[PDB]
Amino acid sequence: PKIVVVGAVAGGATCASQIRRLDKESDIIIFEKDRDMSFANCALPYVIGEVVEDRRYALAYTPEKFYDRKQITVKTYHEVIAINDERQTVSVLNRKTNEQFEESYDKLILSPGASANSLGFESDITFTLRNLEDTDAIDQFIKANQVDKVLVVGAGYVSLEVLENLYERGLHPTLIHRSDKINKLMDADMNQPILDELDKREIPYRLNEEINAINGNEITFKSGKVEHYDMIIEGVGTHPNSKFIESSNIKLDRKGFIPVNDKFETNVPNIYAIGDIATSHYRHVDLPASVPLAWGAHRAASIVAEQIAGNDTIEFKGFLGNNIVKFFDYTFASVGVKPNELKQFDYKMVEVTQGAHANFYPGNSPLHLRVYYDTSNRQILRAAAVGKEGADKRIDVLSMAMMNQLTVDELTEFEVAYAPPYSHPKDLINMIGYKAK
Amino acid sequence: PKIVVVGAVAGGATCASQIRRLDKESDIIIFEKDRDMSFANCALPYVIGEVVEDRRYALAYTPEKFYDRKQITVKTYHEVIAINDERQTVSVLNRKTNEQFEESYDKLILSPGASANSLGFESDITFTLRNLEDTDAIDQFIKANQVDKVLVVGAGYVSLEVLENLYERGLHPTLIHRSDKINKLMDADMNQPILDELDKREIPYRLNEEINAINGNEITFKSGKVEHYDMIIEGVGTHPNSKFIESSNIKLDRKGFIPVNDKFETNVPNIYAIGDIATSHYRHVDLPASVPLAWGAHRAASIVAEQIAGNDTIEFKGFLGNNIVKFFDYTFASVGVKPNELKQFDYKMVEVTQGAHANFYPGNSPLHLRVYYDTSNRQILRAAAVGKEGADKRIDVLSMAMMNQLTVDELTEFEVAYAPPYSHPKDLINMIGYKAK
Ligand SMILES: Cc1cc2nc3c(=O)[nH]c(=O)nc-3n(C[C@H](O)[C@H](O)[C@H](O)COP(=O)(O)OP(=O)(O)OC[C@H]3O[C@@H](n4cnc5c(N)ncnc54)[C@H](O)[C@@H]3O)c2cc1C
Ligand SMILES: Cc1cc2nc3c(=O)[nH]c(=O)nc-3n(C[C@H](O)[C@H](O)[C@H](O)COP(=O)(O)OP(=O)(O)OC[C@H]3O[C@@H](n4cnc5c(N)ncnc54)[C@H](O)[C@@H]3O)c2cc1C
Ligand SMILES: *SCCNC(=O)CCNC(=O)[C@H](O)C(C)(C)COP(=O)(O)OP(=O)(O)OC[C@H]1O[C@@H](n2cnc3c(N)ncnc32)[C@H](O)[C@@H]1OP(=O)(O)O
Ligand SMILES: *SCCNC(=O)CCNC(=O)[C@H](O)C(C)(C)COP(=O)(O)OP(=O)(O)OC[C@H]1O[C@@H](n2cnc3c(N)ncnc32)[C@H](O)[C@@H]1OP(=O)(O)O
Ligand SMILES: [Cl-]
Ligand SMILES: [Cl-]
Ligand SMILES: [Cl-]
Ligand SMILES: [Cl-]
Ligand SMILES: [Cl-]
Ligand SMILES: [Cl-]
Ligand SMILES: [Mg+2]
Ligand SMILES: [Mg+2]
């Protein structure tokens, strides 16, 4: 079939590539509104930090290389401005020429993702971070202005990664956030090490703080404080790129996301939606779920490829919401329903804090593991782990447990790989099971 | 009930402790033939390497402390020399006085573990490593003789740990092993980095090599080579501590181990056996299993405690055989049936070699992950991972999958925790799944 894809990055380019793996005949075209396809979204903060300096790590392909290798046509600087689902075309704006045209499709795959929110100030020194265009512009602004002091706004994983990278680059960031609710995917009382790592490095932060006014480099804050900054990076949330979808027959929720079934089909025949734009359900509980992360974009890309050109019995089984961030020496990982969603269950919490590996063994660091379970059936609802070492391991194991409908009690049966550098004979995971009841 | 435990370490002291958690009234006595209870078996190589300096790390308890904290009586230098099972007593030799006596029991728990094998040479420079007495003697001998050149016999994981520790202490070890099957719980082709790490450090080794004769410090080998060594550590296997059991009604297998049911009961009422002495079965396949490792000792200890003083419906579900060792920069982990046991199944093998984490993120290294599955039912039979980073995480996840008899195909659904320092959007685990079709 003739396949059109909207968005040429984590969901879209991946999906198109996966289809080509299965189907060498179909015409495939991707429209991307910005300059680059296949940029490495998750690498961006590290590019800014000069931790990642090879351009080849910043983006996988140009349209020319992608066509040469895969015979997939990608048109950059082409923005889809409407979906004409009844006539099975999309309307596309060529942004170089400022002329629009219709492109027909047999199958349409929407992976437009989200855009960064902006505070709205009229400021030449303020930047958001979403793509490689943004990344290049930030790097260039730092160099042209000999930037030293940077204000980082917001305390989600993106902002936190950007802050760390600015620091490692040798700049001097200050972090502010409008509330004390930092790193919101993690249990609020488990985020202290973020603040400790800031303090340890004498990196200033202010919570319950906001930009009030900007006058050149002079920033006035809600607290009443007045400071001078060379640059500002705003990480104040994102919004779904769905405005171009609203006039079509595609069902959107009230927040502008696209609900999909387990084949990533929208309500409209022959139109799929994947990536950050799509909403689904949890795998382990009967609740809606939105998990705007890379795993989901990639998993959906594969499922859609099977749906269109492969085994159409392959369907999504729902999200677990596994997520993770590094901040200096610490790892913050969690899986399952969000803190705010726990209230829909009768639940209990169990926790253990123990060395990631043998107590007698050097280089040890306390790992805090917390598990929430449903009192009605003992099923695991959510897990969270924070520590310098071993948090990723414990959370991935618990992700696999939740995939298999394990009860908290059965965690005593988990057979850990034990030697002194790695764990304990009764691992933190086993201890959760013992401590449950 | 009156409880007697034989052996005061990984299985025995643990089980006694777990019973006390549930039962504060029963009299519990443990007999231990050697000097120390609750020594840290797994720390011993690292004590030798002076990685563990604080000997306090090598000994968790003294009998006096155990009685003060847990009201459990532990008699060291007390060797159980017979089990009089029909009268429900054990005969105990007080090694300090060489006088024996009977101790009555309502329940008897056997955790005597295993002893080091010896090559049997008449040599004052040869040592084995099984307890803290041995570690003390080795440490003392190194100092007293200013040991430099040390011959390490045996290539099992503990000998490898001892070798690394001797090297890091500043000594010059040579490794020999009677065959080429080093680190035998791992796939033979995947053990190459052991030899690479030896080579990189110019640590000599010879496989299919054996001691022929010992003449003071002059060692003559099967190969005909003659070398002088200051010390020899023999790691040539272990044997079950069951000689004191042979006169009783307890059934032993032809190798001197004790087959137990899922309640860790022997064939004799009121007698349990746990730890290295006990044999069981696999959880995921119908085959016998012996897994002489710490996790199994600890798990059986809790199950016996529940049987005796807690919830007696709690039973063992069998072993998976999860195991791991660090050797210099590399980790070697496997789980499931042993290499030689694969031939009892119709199976296929899937493998990937990919970066432990995002390719663009610094400090990356190749992680080799291999999965064997049963062709009759797609179930995972065995998995093995080797790499500088991430092998423990992948194998623990696969242990949790196998615990649930998950299929190789379902690995595509595993929801990994992804950020650049940790994994990939399609993790190695997912790739096994995608590559299994
Ligand atoms: C700085 C940063 C760091 C991140 N780190 C992590 C991480 O460590 N772990 C993790 O799991 N996730 C991380 N993410 C999240 C991640 O990248 C997303 O979940 C993923 O990119 C979603 O894929 P997508 O296809 O939905 O959106 P994208 O990959 O953002 O691609 C969407 C594309 O569609 C284009 N588009 C939108 N509308 C139109 C239109 N009307 N016409 C044509 N093109 C259009 C956009 O320009 C865009 O290029 C990070 C994101 C950022 C910005
Ligand atoms: C150097 C070394 C490193 C190791 N590293 C690891 C590792 O990294 N990971 C892992 O999972 N396992 C490791 N192990 C294995 C581990 O320690 C065992 O699996 C575990 O100790 C088994 O518990 P157990 O109670 O059966 O035997 P043990 O802990 O050895 O205790 C048994 C005790 O019973 C006593 N005893 C025996 N007979 C009598 C008797 N007749 N009367 C009175 N007392 C008696 C013994 O003297 C001994 O103290 C290591 C072992 C050694 C020696
Ligand atoms: S924010 C974190 C995520 N970031 C992003 O995703 C960034 C944007 N990504 C993209 O634009 C796409 O994911 C790109 C990079 C365009 C995908 O193109 P690639 O060409 O690099 O990678 P492929 O997916 O095409 O293939 C790479 C190799 O991986 C193996 N492989 C992929 N998919 C499969 C399946 N389904 N089954 C088995 N193996 C698979 C193969 O090694 C493939 O190369 P081979 O030549 O097939 O071996
Ligand atoms: S070779 C690797 C293994 N080798 C060894 O085990 C060496 C010798 N081991 C032993 O002698 C015992 O394992 C000792 C060291 C005596 C300890 O036995 P326990 O496993 O019973 O642990 P503790 O009683 O010392 O308590 C430690 C912490 O774990 C909590 N805990 C243990 N068991 C449970 C159960 N069943 N349920 C809930 N919690 C449990 C303890 O309460 C304790 O927590 P803290 O907050 O640190 O006190
Ligand atoms: Cl990326
Ligand atoms: Cl229309
Ligand atoms: Cl704790
Ligand atoms: Cl230990
Ligand atoms: Cl008798
Ligand atoms: Cl039996
Ligand atoms: Mg219209
Ligand atoms: Mg503690």
Swiss-Prot record, chains A, B:
The protein, known as: Coenzyme A disulfide reductase
Cofactor: FAD
Any single Pfam family the record assigns to this protein: Pyr_redox_dim
HAMAP family: CoA_diS_reduct
InterPro entries: CoA_disulphide_reductase (IPR017758), CoA_disulphide_reductase_staph (IPR023536), FAD-bd_OxRdtase (IPR050260), FAD/NAD-bd_sf (IPR036188), FAD/NAD-binding_dom (IPR023753), FAD/NAD-linked_Rdtase_dimer_sf (IPR016156), Pyr_nucl-diS_OxRdtase_dimer (IPR004099)
Catalytic activity field: NADP(+) + 2 CoA = CoA-disulfide + NADPH + H(+)
Active site positions: C42 (nucleophile), C42 (redox-active)
Swiss-Prot/TrEMBL keywords: FAD, Flavoprotein, NADP, Oxidoreductase, Redox-active center
Family of the protein in this entry: Belongs to the class-III pyridine nucleotide-disulfide oxidoreductase family.
Domain of life: Bacteria
PANTHER family cross-referenced by the UniProt entry: NAD(P)H SULFUR OXIDOREDUCTASE (COA-DEPENDENT), PYRIDINE NUCLEOTIDE-DISULFIDE OXIDOREDUCTASE DOMAIN-CONTAINING
